[PDB]
Amino acid sequence: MRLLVTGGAGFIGSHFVRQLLAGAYPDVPADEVIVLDSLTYAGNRANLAPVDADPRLRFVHGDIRDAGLLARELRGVDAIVHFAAESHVDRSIAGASVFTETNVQGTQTLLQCAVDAGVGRVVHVSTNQVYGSIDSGSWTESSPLEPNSPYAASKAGSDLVARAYHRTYGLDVRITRCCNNYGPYQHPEKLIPLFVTNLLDGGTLPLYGDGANVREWVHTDDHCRGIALVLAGGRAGEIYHIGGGLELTNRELTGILLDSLGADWSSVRKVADRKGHDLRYSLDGGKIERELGYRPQVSFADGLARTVRWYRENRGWWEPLK
Amino acid sequence: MRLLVTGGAGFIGSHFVRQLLAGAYPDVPADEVIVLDSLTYAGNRANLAPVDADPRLRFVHGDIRDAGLLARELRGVDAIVHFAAESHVDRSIAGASVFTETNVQGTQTLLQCAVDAGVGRVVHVSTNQVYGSIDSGSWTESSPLEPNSPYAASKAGSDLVARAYHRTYGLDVRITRCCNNYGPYQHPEKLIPLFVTNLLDGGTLPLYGDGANVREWVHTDDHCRGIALVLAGGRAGEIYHIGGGLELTNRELTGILLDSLGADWSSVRKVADRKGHDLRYSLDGGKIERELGYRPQVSFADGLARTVRWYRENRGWWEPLK
Numbered sequence: 182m183r184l185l186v187t188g189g190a191g192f193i194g195s196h197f198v199r200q201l202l203a204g205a206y207p208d209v210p211a212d213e214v215i216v217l218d219s220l221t222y223a224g225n226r227a228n229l230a231p232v233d234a235d236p237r238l239r240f241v242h243g244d245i246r247d248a249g250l251l252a253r254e255l256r257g258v259d260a261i262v263h264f265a266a267e268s269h270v271d272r273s274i275a276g277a278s279v280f281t282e283t284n285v286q287g288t289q290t291l292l293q294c295a296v297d298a299g300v301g302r303v304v305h306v307s308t309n310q311v312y313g314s315i316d317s318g319s320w321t322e323s324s325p326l327e328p329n330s331p332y333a334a335s336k337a338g339s340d341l342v343a344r345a346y347h348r349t350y351g352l353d354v355r356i357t358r359c360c361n362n363y364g365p366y367q368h369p370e371k372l373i374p375l376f377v378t379n380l381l382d383g384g385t386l387p388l389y390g391d392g393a394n395v396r397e398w399v400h401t402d403d404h405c406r407g408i409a410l411v412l413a414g415g416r417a418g419e420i421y422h423i424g425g426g427l428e429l430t431n432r433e434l435t436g437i438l439l440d441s442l443g444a445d446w447s448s449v450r451k452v453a454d455r456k457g458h459d460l461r462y463s464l465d466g467g468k469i470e471r472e473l474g475y476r477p478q479v480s481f482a483d484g485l486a487r488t489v490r491w492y493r494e495n496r497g498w499w500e501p502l503k
Numbered sequence: 504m505r506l507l508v509t510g511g512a513g514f515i516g517s518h519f520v521r522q523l524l525a526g527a528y529p530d531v532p533a534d535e536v537i538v539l540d541s542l543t544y545a546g547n548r549a550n551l552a553p554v555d556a557d558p559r560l561r562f563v564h565g566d567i568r569d570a571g572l573l574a575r576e577l578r579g580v581d582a583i584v585h586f587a588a589e590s591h592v593d594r595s596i597a598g599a600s601v602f603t604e605t606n607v608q609g610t611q612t613l614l615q616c617a618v619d620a621g622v623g624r625v626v627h628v629s630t631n632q633v634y635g636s637i638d639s640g641s642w643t644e645s646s647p648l649e650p651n652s653p654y655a656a657s658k659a660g661s662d663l664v665a666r667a668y669h670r671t672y673g674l675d676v677r678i679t680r681c682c683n684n685y686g687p688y689q690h691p692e693k694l695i696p697l698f699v700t701n702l703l704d705g706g707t708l709p710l711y712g713d714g715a716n717v718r719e720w721v722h723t724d725d726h727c728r729g730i731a732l733v734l735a736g737g738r739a740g741e742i743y744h745i746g747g748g749l750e751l752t753n754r755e756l757t758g759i760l761l762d763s764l765g766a767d768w769s770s771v772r773k774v775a776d777r778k779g780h781d782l783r784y785s786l787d788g789g790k791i792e793r794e795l796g797y798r799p800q801v802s803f804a805d806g807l808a809r810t811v812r813w814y815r816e817n818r819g820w821w822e823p824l825k
């Protein structure tokens with residue numbers, strides 16, 4: 182079983198690789214694991230340090246946009262788990278082009294090379310942001326694509342490329358959509374690590390707009406497990422939501438973070454709101470529960486405590502990133 | 504070290520604050536920075552957006568003419584950097600009164616409150632226009648005050664108030680005089696931003712009179728650094744010229760601007776000359792060089808390229824101002 186994981190040196194991808202190599206996914210035979218990652222500002226070899234010497238791992242410093250490389254690296258690969266992408270909304274508003282280049286064009290190159298290489302199946306990792314914003318209720322897999330940021334539209338375009346590969350060429354590609362993830366090794370440009378590390382440095386927390394925005398949080402371990410279940414038992418062309426359950430306003434979350442670190446509101450700063458900021462995300466995960474048996478297993482309280490502790494203990498890791 | 508910067512939401516003042524907070528002036532201890540700005544048509548909170556959440560910054564929306572406010576805000580302040588003023592010659596010709604009110608009366612109120620508050624030192628930001636026009640040669644700090652516009656006479660009157668505060672009350676006030684500044688965040692009523700943004704909008708450039716007027720240009724970063732050197736090491740009551748070196752006719756500069764944007768002379772329009780338009784400005788900066796070590800470090804070609812690019816990339820900022 183040869184598996185290729187793109188974006189495996191990033192936050193979620195590295196967790197997937199680590200778990201896999203650790204044997205957390207018995208149903209996912211992985212005798213050979215190739216990680217393909219271009220090492221952008223978000224890719225970090227340290228994320229794979231724990232599995233560095235594993236004889237089953239091959240690390241490829243390269244790009245999904247590189248057709249030649251792929252045509253070689255995908256030879257005899259049975260499956261691909263695709264996490265490689267530009268992932269930050271803020272960066273997408275500031276410089277949008279890279280998002281279409283990596284997310285849409287990169288996905289197309291990858292999927293065409295998969296077809297050319299006879300790859301058996303692909304799990305295309307996506308996000309709940311393709312659905313825009315939802316005032317009340319939760320989105321299901323049939324919800325409309327109404328992305329509001331360049332990042333979200335790039336992911337949605339990638340999802341559409343995946344569909345077309347399945348419909349035109351018969352490629353067995355499965356799509357997952359998940360809510361905000363959190364956990365160790367998340368880059369500090371993201372909300373939780375940013376705020377936790379800012380407090381660790383005795384700094385302020387830049388709370389966008391009024392902090393009323395709502396996000397659903399899932400520990401990355403749960404997301405990864407959902408992906409492994411889709412990889413092992415999903416169906417060609419299907420979309421699967423992987424949720425975490427827990428919905429919080431950014432204000433609520435900030436309070437929780439402050440509490441966790443013994444800090445107070447005085448460390449918060451109201452800053453201009455993000456342009457086109459999505460008010461609320463909420464996913465319905467009944468499909469994957471009923472069809473594949475997935476449900477989040479890490480409680481926010483526990484997961485969060487552990488994450489904060491991780492940041493406390495790994496300044497050497499995050500400091501250089503800030 | 505508590506510092507109060509008036510006019511800190513304007514063009515130059517915001518750059519000074521940003522640089523300071525960024526650590527560009529190691530010799531200027533700034534544990535606490537208060538910015539006092541009345542937010543006239545020229546003051547813009549967006550100019551301080553990048554430093555908004557900095558715990559060392561306190562933004563005070565208020566006026567230098569407000570004695571009561573000052574008497575409170577100057578408590579325990581060690582130094583003041585005074586940039587607040589009405590800065591456009593054209594506006595001064597159209598409605599002169601505000602120039603005496605803000606520039607002269609505002610300075611007097613500020614300096615008297617400084618005395619009442621025991622403020623250690625003040626850097627009064629002034630201009631080369633107090634010297635009138637110079638056909639050949641450059642002005643030194645002993646050059647005569649021969650202002651020709653209501654704006655220039657208001658600045659010169661403010662400089663005289665500063666001298667009197669130093670001579671009568673012992674206030675340690677240092678005066679700086681500089682040439683035309685340019686750079687990001689300059690309000691588009693000024694020559695460069697006006698012409699660059701007009702070209703960006705596909706409009707014409709209103710070239711006053713024959714365009715033969717000569718101006719000396721300095722990037723604001725250099726000016727700010729000169730101010731920081733005077734603040735840290737100048738001497739009470741002294742005047743210091745901060746120059747940029749580069750002298751150009753407005754016609755020459757227009758050509759440079761056109762070139763930079765791929766436009767041509769056809770976009771220019773000869774319009775009536777400004778009343779009492781000063782023919783040429785030229786400052787000698789040997790004093791500050793020999794006494795404080797200052798010399799401009801940003802070459803016009805580089806500085807300008809970057810400025811134009813800034814305007815290209817920040818329509819959202821300037822558009823609302825036009």
Ligand SMILES: NC(=O)c1ccc[n+]([C@@H]2O[C@H](COP(=O)([O-])OP(=O)(O)OC[C@H]3O[C@@H](n4cnc5c(N)ncnc54)[C@H](O)[C@@H]3O)[C@@H](O)[C@H]2O)c1
Nearest residue numbers: 188190191192193219220221223224244245265266268362
């Ligand atoms: N972070 C979340 O909360 C979340 C929620 C849902 C979905 N997702 C999706 O999960 C995936 C992983 O996100 P993440 O948070 O781990 O992202 P990340 O920003 O932590 O990491 C992205 C990784 O992809 C690599 N990469 C970027 N462009 C590349 C290219 N052209 N070729 C090869 N490698 C490239 C980077 O070097 C990096 O290691 C993304 O597709 C993202 O859209 C993320």
Ligand SMILES: NC(=O)c1ccc[n+]([C@@H]2O[C@H](COP(=O)([O-])OP(=O)(O)OC[C@H]3O[C@@H](n4cnc5c(N)ncnc54)[C@H](O)[C@@H]3O)[C@@H](O)[C@H]2O)c1
Nearest residue numbers: 510512513514515541542543545546566567587588590684
């Ligand atoms: N722009 C230049 O090329 C240049 C060259 C030499 C000297 N100067 C001097 O430098 C200083 C800064 O000029 P600038 O170009 O940044 O000006 P500007 O027009 O960009 O900004 C002036 C700022 O002062 C504030 N202000 C005006 N009146 C006020 C009042 N009564 N109380 C408080 N705040 C008030 C405004 O809100 C604004 O933020 C001025 O004193 C100007 O005379 C400018």
Ligand SMILES: Cc1cn([C@H]2C[C@H](O)[C@@H](COP(=O)(O)OP(=O)(O)O[C@H]3O[C@H](CO)[C@@H](O)[C@H](O)[C@H]3O)O2)c(=O)[nH]c1=O
Nearest residue numbers: 268269270308309359360361370371372387388389394431
């Ligand atoms: C970075 C930052 C963020 N925020 C707010 C904006 C959002 O409402 C919320 C979370 O911000 P971010 O960490 O940037 O995450 P968000 O935009 O929700 O998107 C995340 O979750 C998405 C799934 O919802 C993933 O697809 C994205 O890749 C991932 O980055 O916190 C602040 O208030 N201040 C900040 O400094």
Ligand SMILES: Cc1cn([C@H]2C[C@H](O)[C@@H](COP(=O)(O)OP(=O)(O)O[C@H]3O[C@H](CO)[C@@H](O)[C@H](O)[C@H]3O)O2)c(=O)[nH]c1=O
Nearest residue numbers: 590591592630631681682683692693694709710711716753
């Ligand atoms: C706005 C404008 C200006 N001009 C000319 C007039 C001047 O000769 C030259 C620069 O004009 P302004 O941008 O208004 O700048 P100027 O009067 O030289 O004064 C600037 O530099 C001064 C220092 O010299 C500062 O004290 C002033 O605050 C600052 O505004 O360009 C035009 O030909 N057309 C225009 O539309």
